[PDB]
């Protein structure tokens, strides 16, 4: 094999990959977290004022 | 036309109203929350100073 053995002449070398993923995702949701839930039956709802 | 049932084609529909009414007309009236009232008989009253 080549005279001088260096990192560029290596085959079958492990990847040294990282076992995680940078999940940089904001999901605060301040509004929906305090609005409130109310079930309905139709696709159109109305109210009086 | 389509034998399947779709919201746009439904005829008998329960409106699913809100079951209340919203009114914001203020009713504070602080000046009426003063000292109590005083019943009288005649349409003209008076006092000495």
Angle of CA points B4, B6, B10, to nearest 5°: 110
Elucidation technique = cryo-EM
| C-beta separation of A1 from A9 below 8 A | yes
| C-beta separation of B18 from A47 below 8 A | yes
Q: Give CA–CA dist A39/B18, Å, rounded.
A: 11
Tokens 């003063």: give the residue.
Answer: B34
Judged by CB atoms closer than 8 Å, whether chains meet at A46 and B13 is answered as no
Residues of chain A in contact with residue B18, where contact means CB-CB under 8 angstroms, are 45-48
Give the closest-approach CA distance of A32 to chain B in angstroms: 20
Helix (H, G, I), strand (E, B) or coil at A13: coil
Q: Give CA–CA dist A43/B8, Å, rounded.
A: 9
Give the closest-approach CA distance of A28 to chain B in angstroms: 29
């Amino acid at each position: 094999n080549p005279t001088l053995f260096v990192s560029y002449d290596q085959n079958g070398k492990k990847l040294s990959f990282a076992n995680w993923i940078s999940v940089l995702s904001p999901q605060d949701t301040p509004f929906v977290s305090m609005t409130g839930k109310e079930s309905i039956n139709q696709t159109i709802f109305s109210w009086q004022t």
